[PDB]
Write a protein that binds this ligand. Sequence first.
Ligand SMILES: [Mg+2]
Ligand SMILES: [Mg+2]
Lengths: 197, 101, 101, 154, 132, 149, 140
Amino acid sequence: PMRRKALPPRTEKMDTDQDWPSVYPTAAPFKPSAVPLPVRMGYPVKKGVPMAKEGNLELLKIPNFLHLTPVAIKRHCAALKDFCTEWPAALDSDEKCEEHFPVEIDTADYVSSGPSIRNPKARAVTLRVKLSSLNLDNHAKKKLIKLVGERYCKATDVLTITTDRCPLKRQNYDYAVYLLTVLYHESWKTEDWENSK
Amino acid sequence: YYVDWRMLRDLKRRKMAYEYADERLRINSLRKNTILPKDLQEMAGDEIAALPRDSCPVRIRNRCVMTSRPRGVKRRWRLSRIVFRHLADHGLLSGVQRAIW
Amino acid sequence: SPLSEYALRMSRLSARIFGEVARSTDSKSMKVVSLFSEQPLAKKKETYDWYPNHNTYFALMGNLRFLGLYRDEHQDFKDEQRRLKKLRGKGKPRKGEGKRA
Amino acid sequence: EEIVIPKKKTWDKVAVLQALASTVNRDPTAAPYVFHDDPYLIPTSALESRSFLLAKKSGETAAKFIINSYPKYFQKDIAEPHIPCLMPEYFEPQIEDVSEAALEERIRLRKVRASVDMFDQLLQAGTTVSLETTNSLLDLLCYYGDQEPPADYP
Amino acid sequence: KNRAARVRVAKGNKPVSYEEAHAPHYIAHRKGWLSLHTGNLDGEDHAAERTLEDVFLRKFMMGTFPGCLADQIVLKRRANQVDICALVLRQLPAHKFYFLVGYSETLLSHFYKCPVRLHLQTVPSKVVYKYI
Amino acid sequence: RKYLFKGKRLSIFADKAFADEPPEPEASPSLWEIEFAKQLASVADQPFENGFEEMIQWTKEGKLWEFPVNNEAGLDDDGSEFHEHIFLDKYLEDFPKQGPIRLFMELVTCGLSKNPYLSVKQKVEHIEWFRNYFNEKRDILKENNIAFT
Amino acid sequence: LHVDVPKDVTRPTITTSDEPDTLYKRLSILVKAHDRAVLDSYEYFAVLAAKELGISIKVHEPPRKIERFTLLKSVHIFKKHRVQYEMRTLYRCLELKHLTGSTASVYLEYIQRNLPEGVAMEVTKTQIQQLPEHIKEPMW
Ligand SMILES: [Mg+2]
Ligand SMILES: [Mg+2]
C-alpha cells in the first residue's frame, strides 16, 4: 500500500505570457501551487529568511486581490459598459439640478457578511427640498416655516423631512412625499384664527 | 444538553416571556397612564400580577452561552471574560487585538 | 414665555400633520405611546434567541459520532475512563439499588 | 428647457455575472473546476477522475441522508431571505384521513403502492373520486409501471 | 507570569508553527486573524452569532478530519458565503478527501442556511517555524 | 446533389398557417411532461467551469444574495401602504366617540402608527384586544360614568 | 489558450425599457475594515473601475475609530491586574457624482460582489426628482 505522491505544482507549466485573469477568474484563497510568484511572508527568525509560500498560513489569512488585477478590471468594465446609461448632459452643474429637480431623496443600503441580509437602518428615508423651489406666497412661507419647526434651516433654506416610522423603505419614502404635500397645501390655506397673530 | 441546570431555567424564562409579551404589554399599558379610571387600573394591577412569574422579563439573566457564567459577560458577544480572552488571545475573533497605547 | 392662541393652534396643526400627540398629555400618559411604539424587551431576537440550541449541537454531534462521520476525542476519553472504572468495581449503581436502602 | 431623462436599462439578476464570466477563458494548466486544486488531489488518471467525483457525490448523499433522517436538527432557519433548497425534505404523506384529498397527496409525492391502497380503499367505501384525480393516479402508475420510484437508501 | 496562548520554552526540541510561536501581543503586529467577518467593525450587528458559529465550525473540522489538520483553519465570510481554508496533512487517500469535502459542505450549508465551501491545501508534513 | 433542403418532401403535412393553436399548458403539468423536462436539462448538464458559473447557479437557486444588495429583499409586509400603518383611527369607530376611553385609545393608536416592527394585521389585533377588554368591564365603566358600546 | 479560443461568446440580454431612469446626484460609498492595506487595495480597484465606466469619483479617509475595553486578567481575584482589548475601524469614502440608476446598479453590484472579507459597505444614494404634481399647482 504505497502512499500517494503529489504532482509537481502547475506553476511550472505556466508561461510568462499567459492569460492570468483566466487563472484566477473569481475570488479564491491563496494557492501556492497556482500562484507563480516566489512570495514570502512571516517575521523571519534570527539568521533566517521569511517563510516560503508553501504551507504558509499567513498568506492564506490575507484577502488577496489576485482575481482583481489591472488587466482583469479593464476587461471586466469593458463588458459592463453595455449596462450603463448616459447622464443627461444638460445637468452639468449642481445648481442646474436644483432648478429642474429640487427634491433630494436620501436612501441608505448596508452590505455585511452573514446569513441574514436584514438591517434595521435601511427603512429610514430623508427628503430635502428648498423652500425657494416651492411656489410659496409670503403668507404661505411663514406658515410653512412655523409648522415644520426645526426641520427648516434658515441659513440654507432647506426643509428636511426624515421618515423612519413605517416598516419598509417604499412606505417611508411615500410618507415623506405625503408630508410635503400636506404641509404645502396647508400652508396656503388660511384659517380664521390666523388673523389673531 | 445545556451547560447546566441554571442555563436551562433561564432558557424557559426567556421562552415564556416571549409568549406573554403582547399580553403583559396590553395590560401594563392600562396602568401606565392617568387617563383611565383608577378602578380599572387597580383591576389591571392584579391581572398582571396573576400571570405566571416566569413571564416577568426582569427574571432573565444574561449568562455566558458557553459556560453559563452569570457575571463577567460581554453583551456584544454573550461570552464571559474568561471565554472571550481564550478566543481573542488565539486570533479567533475577527478584528480583536490587544490594546497598546 | 407663554404660548399665545396662534402659537398653540399652530402647534396642534403641526402635530396633526406629523402624526404626533395632539392633546396635552402628562409625562405619565406618554408612556402608552412609548410602550406601543417600541418593541418590548422580551420580543427582541437578542433576548429570546440569546442561547444557541445546546440540545441540537449535543444531539447532532452525538448522532454523527455513532455514524462514524465525527470523532469526539473528549467522549472517547470519557468512554474509556468508564470502562476502566467499571472493571475496578467503581461503576454506577443501578437506580433504586443504591448503598442506602 | 425640459431635461431628457435616459430610459432605464433592465437585466436579469444573473446578467452581471454572465458578463463577467464571458471575459475569462479556460485555464490550460489547471484541472477541471470540479476537481480540488491541490497537487495531492488532482486526478492523475481518467479512472481517478471518475472515482474522485463519485466519492464527492457519495459524501453529498451521506449528508443529505443525515439531514433527511434527523430533520429536527436542520430546522432552525436563520437565512433572510429564506432559502427553500437548504431545508430538510419530507416525502412521506402526512394526511392520515382516507379521502380523495389524501389520495391526491400520495399521487403528488409519487408513491405508487400507498396510492393504490388508498384508491382501492376509497372504492371500497365508494366515495366519489374525480376523473382528473383518477387520471393523476394512472399517470403515476403508468409512468413508473407499477413499481416504486427508484431510490437509494440503507 | 502570563500564560495565555503562550507555548513555553523547553530544551530546544519542541517544534512550533508560526501561529503557535507568537503570543497574543503579536496579534495585528506579526500574525493576523484566523477569522475575517464584518461583525466586530464599528456599528455592526450579529457579532455573537458569527463568534458562536466559528467556535462550532472549528470543532466540526477537527472531528471530521481527525489527525489530518496541519494548522488551525481560516474562516472567510463574504456576503452570505462561508469559506473554510484548512492546511491538511497528506495522510488520507485522495478519494477520502473528496468524500469529506462533499459531506462537510452539504452538512454545514443545511445547518447554517448559507453556502459553505471547503478549501484544502495539502502539505507533506507540518511546517515548523522554529524549535523552542 | 444531396441538397439537404432541395428536393421532394413527404408532403403528408401542410404548411402551418395556424401554429400552436392549443396552448402548451393544456392541462396542469403531468408526470410525463414534468419528467421529460428534467431529462432535457440533463442533456446540457455539464459541471461548473469556474467560480462565476457556480455563483450563477447559486443565484438561480436563491442560495446566494442578489446584487446590488437590498436589505428588504423579499420583505413585503402584506403589500401594505404608509397610510394603512399611519392612519389607524378607522378601527376606533366601535369605541366611544368621546371621553376617557377615546383619550386612551388615541395614545394607543399614536404609538402603533410609530411602530415599524409590527404589521397592520398585528396592530389591529392590539386594537381589537382593548375593544373586548372594555366590553368585559362594562359594569365597572358604568359606575365611573363611562358608557362603552 | 493558444489555438483553442471561443468563437462567439454569449452575452447577457440588456433590454431598454420605456420607464424613465433614476438620477442620483450623489452616491457615497463608506467602506469599513480593520485593515488599512485592504482599504488601499479596494480603493484602487474601485477608483480604477469607476474611471473605466465613465463615473466621476473622489476619495477621502474619514478619521479612524478605536474602541477599547478592559477585562479582568485572572479567573479569580487579583482585581488590580487587567487586560485591555481594542477594535480598530478604518474608513474610506468613495463619493460618486451624477449617476443614472442603471449606472449605479451595475457599478455597485460589481464592486459589492468583490468586497473582500472583513470589509463592510454603507451606500448612501441621493436621488433627485421633480416636485409632486399636486404640489406643483396650489389647489384649495
Ligand atoms: Mg456541572
Ligand atoms: Mg438582572
